[PDB]
Write an enzyme that holds these catalytic residues in place. Structure first.
Site, PDB file in Angstrom:
ATOM      1  N   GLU A 157      45.705  98.254  18.378  1.00 51.65           N
ATOM      2  CA  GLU A 157      46.415  98.774  17.206  1.00 51.65           C
ATOM      3  C   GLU A 157      45.487  99.734  16.473  1.00 51.65           C
ATOM      4  O   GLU A 157      45.124  99.519  15.303  1.00 51.65           O
ATOM      5  CB  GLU A 157      46.883  97.613  16.328  1.00 51.65           C
ATOM      6  CG  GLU A 157      47.984  96.804  16.968  1.00 51.65           C
ATOM      7  CD  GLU A 157      48.468  95.636  16.144  1.00 51.65           C
ATOM      8  OE1 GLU A 157      47.949  95.412  15.018  1.00 51.65           O
ATOM      9  OE2 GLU A 157      49.406  94.917  16.565  1.00 51.65           O
ATOM     10  N   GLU A 280      53.810  92.990  21.894  1.00 50.44           N
ATOM     11  CA  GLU A 280      53.823  91.914  20.909  1.00 50.44           C
ATOM     12  C   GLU A 280      55.127  91.935  20.140  1.00 50.44           C
ATOM     13  O   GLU A 280      55.561  92.995  19.662  1.00 50.44           O
ATOM     14  CB  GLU A 280      52.699  92.015  19.859  1.00 50.44           C
ATOM     15  CG  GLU A 280      51.314  91.857  20.475  1.00 50.44           C
ATOM     16  CD  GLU A 280      50.203  91.810  19.478  1.00 50.44           C
ATOM     17  OE1 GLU A 280      50.465  91.632  18.279  1.00 50.44           O
ATOM     18  OE2 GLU A 280      49.034  92.001  19.909  1.00 50.44           O
TER      19      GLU A 280
END
Length: 350
Positions: A157, A280
């Site tokens: 991320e 995710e």
């Protein structure tokens, strides 16, 4: 085992369809404490040391992908070599083989790197490029001879932690630096020999988010046809992630909002020939099992209909009414806390 089945003649969209439904070994190789912790980081967030028997249960339930998030910070040395601790790399390899021995896909990434070194600014670009290169050179070399069931996710991320644009899609500068880092990582991986010229690779947008500016500014390194976009979509935000808020899910507005988010990804990438993995998603435990079941089934169904596999974040943290309570498997009893959610995911995935 699928560890040594080589590289099929297969496209990225075909591979992601077969990946189907995934489960992340969360809060495990991604957990961190300090530079002194060493191998003890694996267990420092309350997950027992990973065993093949745990992975066997994941396979048995109907998952076809295990994602192994790995935080390397805390386990590598000084610049310029950034040497990865040999015991850490060997432990990662053990867990990779638990997964491949179950005839499933495995994803390995770089995980919580942004807190220290993976800072995507023009000022830090040179250092972060050298560092991501040195790390992937070592990781890719170690894993070079594995089959196409092993996927490398170049970053998790990427974002500037604490900055104003962290959760708004980044700045244009941040997104440009991320494109430079993914290009360097892909070029490094592809140059390391074995099967790595042909391995499928995942690359995230800024913060792996699905916001328009982040998806539009992503550049696929070299337009390489074996690159998959990595998105993390805990959608919708309050229901999925926030304790003491929004415990119900299932109205037509709820469904259409999620379909809209997935249509946006389908229209931007899938329909344009670019594979995507939602690496995710999930929902926390608000004593709201029926909403979590409806949401899990609908998410998996609507993603599957759009050719997008989804991977539940199983951090092993159990706690009704608590933050970040995403657990599905009890890794000590080898039984499921929420078999109803597992069944909804597997049914939704087809």
């Amino acid at each position: 085992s699928v560890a040594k089945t080589g590289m099929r003649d297969i496209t990225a969209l075909e591979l992601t369809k077969d990946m189907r439904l995934g489960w992340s070994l969360g809060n495990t190789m991604d957990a961190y404490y300090s530079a002194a912790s060493g191998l003890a980081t694996e267990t420092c967030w309350g997950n027992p040391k990973t065993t093949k028997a745990m992975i066997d249960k994941v396979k048995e339930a109907g998952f076809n992908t295990v994602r192994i998030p790995i935080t390397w910070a805390g386990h590598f040395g000084s610049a310029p070599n950034y040497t990865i601790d040999s015991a850490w790399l060997s432990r990662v390899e053990e867990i990779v083989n638990y997964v491949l021995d179950n005839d499933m896909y495995a994803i390995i990434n770089l995980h919580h790197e942004e807190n220290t070194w993976l800072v995507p600014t023009y000022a830090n670009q040179e250092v972060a490029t050298a560092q991501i290169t040195k790390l992937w050179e070592q990781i890719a070399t170690r894993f070079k001879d594995y089959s196409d069931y092993l996927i490398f996710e170049a970053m998790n991320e990427p974002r500037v932690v604490g900055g104003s644009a962290e959760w708004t899609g980044g700045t244009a500068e941040n997104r440009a630096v991320i494109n430079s880092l993914s290009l360097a990582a892909v070029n490094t991986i592809r140059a390391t020999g074995g099967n790595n010229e042909k391995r499928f690779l995942m690359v995230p947008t800024h913060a792996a988010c699905s916001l328009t500016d982040a998806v539009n500014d992503l550049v696929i390194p070299n337009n390489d046809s074996k690159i998959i976009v990595s998105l993390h979509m805990y959608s919708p935000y309050y229901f999925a992630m926030v304790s003491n808020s929004t415990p119900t899910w299932g109205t037509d507005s709820d469904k259409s909002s999620l379909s809209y988010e997935l249509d946006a990804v389908y229209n931007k990438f899938i329909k344009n020939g670019r594979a995507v993995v939602i690496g995710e998603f999930g929902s926390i435990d608000k004593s709201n099992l029926s909403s979590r079941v409806t949401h899990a089934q609908y998410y998996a169904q609507e993603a599957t209909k759009r050719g997008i596999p989804v991977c539940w974040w199983d951090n092993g943290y159990y706690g009704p009414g608590k933050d970040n309570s995403y657990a599905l498997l009890n890794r000590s009893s080898l039984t499921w806390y929420y078999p109803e959610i597992v069944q909804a995911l597997v049914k939704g995935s087809g």
